[PDB]
Amino acid sequence: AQNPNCNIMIFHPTKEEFNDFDKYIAYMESQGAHRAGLAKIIPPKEWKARETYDNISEILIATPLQQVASGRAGVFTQYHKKKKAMTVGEYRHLANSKKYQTPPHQNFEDLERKYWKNRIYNSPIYGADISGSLFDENTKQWNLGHLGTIQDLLEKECGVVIEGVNTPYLYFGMWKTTFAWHTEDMDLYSINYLHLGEPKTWYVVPPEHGQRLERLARELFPGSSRGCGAFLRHKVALISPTVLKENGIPFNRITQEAGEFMVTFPYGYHAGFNHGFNCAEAINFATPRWIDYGKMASQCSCGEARVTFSMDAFVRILQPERYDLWKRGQD
Ligand SMILES: O=C(O)CNC(=O)C(=O)O
Ligand SMILES: [Mg+2]
Ligand code: NI
Ligand SMILES: [Zn+2]
């Protein structure tokens, strides 16, 4: 068995290996990369996502979200308070202001210590989930707006044609902006490219151990667990590495820098935070190996998780017994 300790693997494809996206994902899996839940892909030196980032300031963040925490430093939830629209240039100036800027630090480990100690005492503002792309149309390799669609994969594997579309999303972050513990919708893969700016630190639980994280979360968030049998789908709960180690939960951590891709694998729980002003692009995707995970994915039916149009068909075809209850949650 390849990668039996479930370590995060880092890949350096050549320009020739960067041509065929599906083939390279399958290669990484042949080496055991999926067992970690997360892999890093460093593009060949010949590649670029676009020529410059000098002309992005006029992108609008229609609904910036202020991430307000409740709880204790290592075990907390966050809710998202909606703020007035602002441009990417306006948000960048805000991120760099004395109230929001990254503090002085020695290295990534010192910054990580500061994040866990102090996050709850601040409310950073995140531009999330903005439909769009920063890849140049002429970039042919690993262009997250030109991937094979999940609807086409389902149709190729299972023969059923379904409605829905699959497009990328932009994230504009600042110091302390936080992504809560989650797997993807329908336990899909994700791919995330850090276009510019400061790093993003990730934490991940191997897919084979995901239920250990779920049992800890039910213990730590007991009201939320009574409310919903899949409350991590709400994407609001944070648990620190120190608390995970205290409770014997297997995990790994890695820091992504600008110019690097991360891939999350089916049922790989992940969480993390941004170091300072940055911009990332991400999209979900599928492969043949995903289908069995899609069929077994948990679902939130309490009403909180509310998701995209295209998840309807995935539930309807892969999980027909659950469909009626899930759809009641959506309506
Ligand atoms: O970058 C973020 O805020 C969160 N991204 C992801 O969870 C991802 O790419 O799967
Ligand atoms: Mg612009
Ligand atoms: Ni994710
Ligand atoms: Zn729910």
CATH number at 106 reads: 2.60.120.650
Signed CA dihedral, 194, 151, 266, 234: sign only: positive
Solved with: X-ray
**Number of domains forming the structure of the chain:** 1
311-318 vs 320-330: helix crossing angle, rounded to 10: 150
For ligand 1, atom 3, name the residue with the nearest CA.
179
β 38-41/125-131 pair status: unpaired
Give bridge partners of residue 141 from the DSSP assignment: none
Identify the DSSP state of 103.
P
Token pair recorded at residue 259: 């110019």
**Coil, strand or helix: which one is 207?**
helix
Distance in angstroms (rounded) separating the CA atoms of residues 228 and 300: 7
For ligand 1, atom 4, name the residue with the nearest CA.
179
> Do residues 305 and 234 make contact, with C-beta atoms less than 8 angstroms apart?
yes
Distance in angstroms (rounded) separating the CA atoms of residues 290 and 266: 6
For ligand 1, atom 9, name the residue with the nearest CA.
192
Nearest C-alpha neighbor of 43 from the set 222, 258, 330, 317: 258
Identify the DSSP state of 148.
P
Distance in angstroms (rounded) separating the CA atoms of residues 154 and 235: 26
> Do residues 12 and 42 make contact, with C-beta atoms less than 8 angstroms apart?
yes
Distance of alpha carbon 188 from the chain centroid? 11
The C-alpha R_g of the chain, in whole angstroms, comes to 19
- The answer to whether the CB of 217 is under 6 A from ligand 1 is no
Domain residue limits at 194: 1-331
Considering every ligand atom, which ligand is closest to the CA of 88? 2
> Do residues 33 and 11 make contact, with C-beta atoms less than 8 angstroms apart?
yes
Give the largest Cα separation in the chain, rounded. Answer: 55
Q: Is 115 exposed, middle or buried (0-12, 13-18, 19+ CB in 10 A)?
A: buried
Ramachandran region, residue 250 (left: φ > 0; alpha: ψ -120 to 50; beta: rest): beta
**Coil, strand or helix: which one is 183?**
coil
Secondary structure (DSSP) of 12-65:
---TTTTS-HHHHHHHHHHTTGGGGSEEEEPPPTT--S-S-STT-TT-EESS-E
